[PDB]
Design a protein around this ligand. Structure first.
Ligand SMILES: [Cl-]
Ligand SMILES: [Cl-]
Ligand SMILES: [Mg+2]
Ligand SMILES: [Mg+2]
Lengths: 128, 142
């Protein structure tokens, strides 16, 4: 891939990732999508690039598409449950509350991120 | 590999073969059977092709991912195996078997603290008592 051969310098890739988030934060979702797709073409194996594109799909209400990428991101990161938390959100929106409950429960049981667990527990408290 | 394909599919966000139900479940079941027929006879390279085929069609399938991850582990492609076992756990959050295998792979990748995390998770959360003994044997070695 382009990343394998260092086709673009590291600092310029950092810049592009930051610009992608600038677009996302100012609600320029179409431009952010182009940029996060560019990043994931450059390095499909970069968990934070994948999370950025998954965030785009989630904000576009493409919830299964986001959940799919969140599964890959979780797998590649191994011990970061943030993608599992966002998967739970996606499953709620897909009307799959038992799958969502499983996700938030997994965050509670495995995550060492205390702030993330507070958010997961709030979701669990509301699930019927 | 199988992960690259999944990510490329997600980027391009077009229609996939599965989107149009190009291969029915019954034929997928058959191809999976043939993959294990190859695997069990030692025809690992042909089994790998068949599991790669199943994972192109239906990547988000725990049984297909686990079959392919086992092949990479036996071939000592431990990073590819670890990544796929991690996908398998994501896809089946109540089976700690792929977490145990991820731990074995991490040990071979010289990542003992990652391995220890995996085996500790098995001990604390799995109800598979024999799997817990296996995980503990690795922890005792670390
Ligand atoms: Cl459900
Ligand atoms: Cl791959
Ligand atoms: Mg799709
Ligand atoms: Mg127990």
């Amino acid at each position: 891939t382009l990343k394998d051969i260092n086709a673009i310098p590291d600092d310029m890739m950092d810049d592009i990732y930051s610009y992608a988030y600038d677009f996302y934060n100012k609600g320029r979702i179409e431009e952010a999508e182009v940029f996060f797709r560019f990043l994931c073409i450059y390095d499909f194996y970069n968990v934070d690039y994948i999370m950025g594109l998954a965030a785009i799909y989630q904000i576009k209400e493409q919830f299964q598409q986001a959940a799919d990428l969140y599964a890959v991101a979780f797998a590649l990161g191994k011990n970061d449950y943030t993608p599992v938390f966002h998967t739970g959100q996606c499953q709620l929106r897909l009307k799959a509350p038992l799958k969502a409950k499983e996700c938030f429960e997994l965050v509670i049981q495995h995550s060492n991120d205390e702030k993330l667990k507070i958010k997961a527990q709030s979701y669990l408290d509301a699930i019927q």
